[PDB]
């Protein structure tokens, strides 16, 4: 488990219907929402990766027990014991498979949320601080285009550092 989804993030956003992860922002001009393309694709590709292995297909079997006539009692019992054995094995494997896969899927989605959050933190550098709920409190005015540069990963921290520091400190 990584720290984010069902972690320090309080809940999910039903509203955000265009991606798996993304950004909400607050500035003098208002409020906006946007999805992050790269992080949602990275998660989605890994899911489809799993699905591809799942549907991977096989060996031809022929009948070893007659549907419409009697089999000799003793070899009948052997076949019965053997099939039920094989079936318990696949049953158990099929339970294991989805339990393990599901755990990892969940934790993987968490990790891509974290890696997004981590990327942003490192960009903002000394210009923001974390509020512990997944938001970065930014210490300069940040207009729509400035928000854009953050989600777009072109935000230059040095451009705001001076202002930022004396706002963090006074």
């Amino acid at each position: 488990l990584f720290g984010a989804i069902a972690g320090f993030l309080e809940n999910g956003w039903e509203g955000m219907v265009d991606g798996w992860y993304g950004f909400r922002h607050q500035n003098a001009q208002g409020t906006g929402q946007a999805a992050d393309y790269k992080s949602t694709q990275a998660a989605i590709d890994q899911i489809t990766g799993k699905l591809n292995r799942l549907v991977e297909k096989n060996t031809e079997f022929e009948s070893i027990e007659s549907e419409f006539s009697e089999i000799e009692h003793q070899i009948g019992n052997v076949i019965n014991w053997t099939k039920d054995s094989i079936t318990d094995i696949w049953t158990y494997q099929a339970e294991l498979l989805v339990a393990m896969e599901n755990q990892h899927t969940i934790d993987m989605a968490d990790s891509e949320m974290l890696n997004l959050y981590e990327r942003v933190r490192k960009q903002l550098r000394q210009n923001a601080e974390e509020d512990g709920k997944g938001c970065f409190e930014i210490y300069h005015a940040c207009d729509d285009s400035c928000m854009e540069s953050i989600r777009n990963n072109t935000y230059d921290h040095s451009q705001y550092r001076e202002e930022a520091l004396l706002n963090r400190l006074n």
């Binding site: 989804i5 219907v17 993304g22 699905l51 096989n58 009948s63 007659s66 549907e67 419409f68 969940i106």
Partner: protein, 318 residues
């Protein structure tokens, strides 16, 4: 002035299982266990034979109901539930191994045995039990040999099938067990009856077991069948004295086919690789819970209705 990170969620999530948690809600999930089948035998791209009320055993000995299934080629052979193997009472020794060889084959040819019989033998006998086109008849592939001159001893007779081909041939014959001492004497004579069958590798002996008293008791007239494989270059000889139901043809099983037992109707427009008593299974899922009895290329049977694979993150609604 603030930028917040987060993830999506849905109003209705799906519940899946993990190592640490049953009832774990996620945004989306798909089924790994196929639970629904096609109730028809999809035979597109398959050279198949539906045997109708003809049992595979019937094919080799030529019971009336298999007259249209005495030969053929196929990659798939379909057997139906109450198919007819026999027109006269009796049974086949080692029947399940023979049925599987047939159901494993890719087709059948017939080769004449060449058997001829002397003047003192009647080979053209027939029976009310085996009707063909409203007349007394018999297994197409066999001959009921009796003494032409009733009450008289069946002559010591010899017959030899020679496999002059490059593959093993399957020869069947029958032994007649009369319903009484009276019946036996009339067909074959008072003499002790012995039916001997010998190849390079196979040997066996048969003595007709003579029934008693009324026809409705358990010891009444029957013809039981025996078979063996004759190798290329090898001969098989019948030395008999009365009681032998002789092959006028033997069979040649050819190539491999898939054997299906099912009462599902043939659908020629769909294609499939997996079959069970109930029809076909076409699916990409690796498991199925339709039947533990399948043939072909199949998903593995599991004892579970549903096994959901998560295709999304934990669903955390507000």
């Amino acid at each position: 002035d603030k930028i917040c990170l987060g993830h999506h969620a849905v109003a209705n999530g799906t519940i899946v299982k993990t190592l640490t948690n049953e009832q774990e809600e996620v945004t989306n999930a798909t089924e790994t266990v196929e639970s629904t089948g096609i109730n028809r035998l999809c035979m597109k791209g398959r050279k198949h034979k539906d045997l109708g009320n003809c049992h595979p055993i019937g094919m080799l000995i030529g019971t009336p109901a298999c007259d249209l299934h005495l030969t053929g080629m196929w990659d798939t052979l379909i057997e139906r539930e109450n198919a007819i193997a026999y027109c006269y009472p009796g049974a086949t020794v080692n029947v399940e191994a023979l049925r599987q060889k047939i159901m494993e084959s890719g087709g059948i040819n017939k080769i004449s045995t060449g058997f001829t019989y002397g003047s003192s033998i009647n080979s053209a006998g027939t029976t009310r039990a085996c009707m063909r086109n409203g007349g007394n008849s018999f297994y197409a592939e066999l001959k009921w040999l009796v003494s032409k001159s009733a009450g008289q001893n069946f002559p010591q007779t010899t017959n030899t099938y020679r496999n002059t081909d490059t593959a093993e041939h399957l020869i069947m014959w029958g032994i007649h067990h009369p319903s009484s001492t009276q019946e036996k004497n009339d067909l074959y004579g008072t003499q002790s009856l012995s039916i001997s069958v010998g190849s390079s590798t196979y040997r066996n002996n048969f003595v007709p077991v003579v029934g008693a008293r009324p026809q409705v008791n358990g010891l009444s007239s029957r013809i039981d069948f025996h078979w063996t494989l004759v190798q290329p270059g090898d001969n098989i000889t019948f030395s008999h004295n009365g009681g032998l139901i002789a092959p006028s043809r033997v069979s040649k099983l050819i190539g491999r086919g898939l054997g299906i037992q099912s009462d599902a109707p043939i659908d020629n427009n769909c294609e499939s690789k997996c079959f069970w008593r109930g029809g076909s299974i076409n699916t990409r899922l690796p498991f199925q819970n339709l039947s533990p009895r399948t043939v072909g290329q199949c998903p593995k049977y599991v004892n579970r209705r549903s096994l959901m694979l998560a295709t999304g993150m934990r669903n955390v609604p507000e």
